[PDB]
């Protein structure tokens, strides 16, 4: 609907169509006046849901077959422009989402590496202390693995 | 005495215990400290009727 | 002569915002986790368009644009009073008509100049100037929010 | 002679609010784990502009 009601879409459609090229006079002012006159030939009447009236488009032309073909082509043109814009917006949102996901994955990897390094350091210190105190008994405490890192040395 | 001394030494050499939330906050703070990337001249509008 | 021209603008797209959209999405995601205040707030596009509209109709923006437009500088008699009066008149020349969503009419800006090409070139330059100012203001706001978030995270 | 001049103002932004914004946000964060406040509360800049 936004593409339908826009002035730019009407101007580009009239510039592209053959109904306007054959009516060119060759004078810039006359061509501009003709284009502006044919811009208003397409009127968009917005619809209201309360009164059960839908959006409508009216086109005006010199000849009835033209008045039909031009309207069909203009509606197709507006639909194509809307589809292209929607595709571009979808691509932009996709790029933003993948950037965010990459950043989140990087952060999770950093967190995992930090935890791994901390556990490695704790393992090294526990090994050194167990060697110093010569506690070679493999079984020292009833609780199984996943002990808190603080009293982690209670192992062979 | 031996086990108590070993507990003291281990808890001294290990340091304070940090949960996962602290690590996540540190990781986020790293990216925050990286700093935002500011680019000007990006459009804030789209044309429905180009001036003529 | 007082030739006039009209422009109609709407919200930008994701793809034209650039990296600012990703940065603001990151900050909003951070705000979601702590200090929950989202409450399905208006998207980044609405905020950017609101800032652009605010900079479009501001008297200060029109004054600063006219002061450097290179079209006002030619019409400088050299008297302070005459220059001030002309500047006020030309500031009043640019008008902004806000749009109503109920009637499906959008925001429009109308410029009045002395010659026909100047009614177009000056309007294009003014819209670009307002967009640039809005972008700079948005970047400053983003920097401030980023600094505040960094300080809060450091404290936590 | 009766000359006149006019000014138009609006709500400030985060950047010009200085350090007060961070303090107020910290207090609000302390005030959402106790004595529940409305989620859709007016923001800091809105309150500052209302006071102004």
Numbering used by the authors:
A (entry chain H): 105 to 260
B (entry chain A): 261 to 312
C (entry chain A): 53 to 208
D (entry chain F): 53 to 104
Which passages does the manuscript contain on this structure?
This alternating arrangement and a highly negatively charged binding face create a dynamic environment in which the polysaccharide chain is extended, and suggest a ratchet-type mechanism for polysaccharide elongation.
Thus, in order to resolve this alternating arrangement of loops, C4 symmetry was applied by using two adjacent subunits encompassing the two L4 conformations as the asymmetric unit resulting in a 3.2 Å map.
